Write a protein that binds this ligand. Structure first.
Ligand SMILES: Cn1cc(-c2cc(-c3cc(Cl)c(F)c(OCc4ccccc4Cl)c3)c(=O)n(-c3cccnc3)c2)c(=O)[nH]c1=O
Ligand SMILES: Cn1cc(-c2cc(-c3cc(Cl)c(F)c(OCc4ccccc4Cl)c3)c(=O)n(-c3cccnc3)c2)c(=O)[nH]c1=O
Lengths: 300, 300
């Protein structure tokens, strides 16, 4: 009963967030085992951020120039390296609160949980998705850099995101914990376009099955449709094409609800073609798409 | 840059959530110092929930009939009592992870953070508000009972809510950690109406100032208005009347934005009187009202 944008419980990840200070720049880092991950532009200066040669900058730097503070206790840096666009600071201590963790690289449409941080101190948590153009619509201010995205399968925290920068368009970009940017984005202050953002078609169909479970059934109709016909409508409107894989994913939701997936697609088409007429589906005058089929089952 | 429904970081409260089993009924509890709080209908049975005499039931029960499990470790109950609609189980141990905490009773419109639990294990976290009719629109399934609502001022966790029941209308009701229900609700399965739910007028004005900070300024106009005239419009539409207190609260947001509060009210009236014409304010085709003026400053 009820449906909300829930976020994974953030306890495990709070215990890994540290402050990382280089020169005058300060930003958050992730402390797992005896290594501290943080964005590499920590080492950039005002002038260098137009186009930095990170090798040149990383080279003039030494371990004592990196100041890592775990809450109110300083860690000793004894090794530094650069994997893609992240710094990896070896430290003398192993975090006693290291959970079971993993570094996964996720796919556009998958949702994760963000623990927004400033000076290594938790501030808030929220759920969001990886847009198909590999940007995210988050909540980030100066110092938010280094904040992590993560999923918790049970006792294992799968880290998928590290925040780096806002684009001039107010959208954010980041890397995986190996340092690979999601998208065609680089960590220099130069012209970078986001690209065409479509809707996560499968996540909307998952969010509609959630509504039939919770009482909102007004959007249902007596029509049906073909996979091909729907996508033609999902192209006029900018919707990610729906595939057979996507239909198998939604199978569990169809068996619960007794509604063929292609019958849900038929109602989505009418919602696209005719709008909502000022109505509401779980308190949203817009069709939400940041709920994965798995999310809806997780939350039931 | 960006604005989202953030929730307080949930680490501190996760460490207080325990499982509480009585008879066949199981539900979550809150373990602070050497006491375990949980809803009292833990002691009810199928038949008794029509109208239970909690004294009668509480009386036939003894300390060993209450089973408290902190994760995977059992606590010994050595005292039981009933404060309003909550059970208070004295235990031999004092939770090593008790934070600085407080029991506040909040007012309709104030927002808090929920840590939804089942069998005393965190599942997810989300932000929500106390509707003016003292109900909440949350995310709760069977076993969600005992989950807590809380605000974190800095290092002090102010507990304000404990979940008890869903109403037949899909809305939830709860108590404060002293056991007083928010609203005219009782903990028996009988006819209880929610009441007229209005919109938190001040929280919308706080959410509109947030939009001017983040780039969405299309809803602004060259009009003004009087406090009285607006409320007349806030009565036709079901909006909590706006008071001078409410205007002083929004003062900080007006000094940041250079927009008189009564000029924001003038745009809200047009948004009410003329709708949004399919537009968007921070990605919401509806006027959101679960952001307190303080929330918007917290998140900036
Ligand atoms: C010195 N310094 C800097 C930062 C810091 C750096 C950045 C930042 C980092 C890199 Cl590599 C950039 F290429 C960059 O240009 C992105 C860009 C490209 C093209 C047009 C416009 C733009 Cl904006 C920006 C940032 O985006 N943010 C931020 C701010 C607000 C919300 N989210 C992220 C913050 C910091 O946190 N601490 C600290 O000391
Ligand atoms: C045996 N038993 C029972 C519960 C349990 C009890 C309740 C519950 C508790 C009390 Cl005092 C009630 F007066 C009650 O009638 C509310 C009502 C009144 C009038 C018309 C309809 C209704 Cl529904 C309900 C519940 O509402 N929920 C729940 C379920 C789904 C989401 N949220 C809350 C769960 C439990 O958790 N564990 C366990 O073992």
């Amino acid at each position: 009963s009820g449906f909300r944008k829930m976020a994974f419980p953030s306890g495990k990840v709070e215990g890994c967030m540290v402050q990382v200070t280089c020169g005058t720049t300060t930003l958050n880092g992730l402390w797992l085992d005896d290594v501290v991950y943080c964005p590499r532009h920590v080492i950039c200066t005002s002038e260098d951020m137009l186009n930095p040669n990170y090798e040149d900058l990383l080279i003039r730097k030494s371990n004592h120039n990196f100041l890592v503070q775990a809450g109110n206790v300083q860690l000793r840096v004894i090794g530094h390296s650069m994997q893609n666009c992240v710094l990896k600071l070896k430290v003398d201590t192993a975090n006693p609160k290291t959970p079971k963790y993993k570094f996964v690289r996720i796919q556009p449409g998958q949702t994760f949980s963000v623990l927004a941080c400033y000076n290594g101190s938790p501030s808030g948590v929220y759920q969001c998705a990886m847009r198909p153009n590999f940007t995210i619509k988050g909540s980030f201010l100066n110092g938010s850099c280094g904040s992590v995205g993560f999923n918790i399968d049970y006792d294992c925290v799968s880290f998928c995101y590290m925040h780096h920068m806002v684009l001039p368009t107010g959208v954010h970009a980041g890397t995986d914990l190996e340092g690979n940017f999601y998208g065609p984005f680089v960590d220099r202050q130069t012209a970078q376009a986001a690209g065409t953002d479509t809707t996560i078609t499968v996540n909307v169909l998952a969010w509609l099955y959630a509504a039939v479970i919770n009482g909102d059934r007004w959007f249902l109709n007596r029509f049906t449709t073909t996979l091909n016909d729907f996508n033609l409508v999902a192209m006029k409107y900018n919707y990610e094409p729906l595939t057979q894989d996507h239909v198998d994913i939604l199978g569990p939701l169809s068996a619960q609800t007794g509604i063929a997936v292609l019958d849900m697609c038929a109602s989505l088409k009418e919602l696209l073609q005719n709008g909502m007429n000022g109505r509401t589906i779980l308190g949203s005058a817009l069709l939400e798409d940041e709920f994965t089929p798995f999310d809806v089952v997780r939350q039931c």
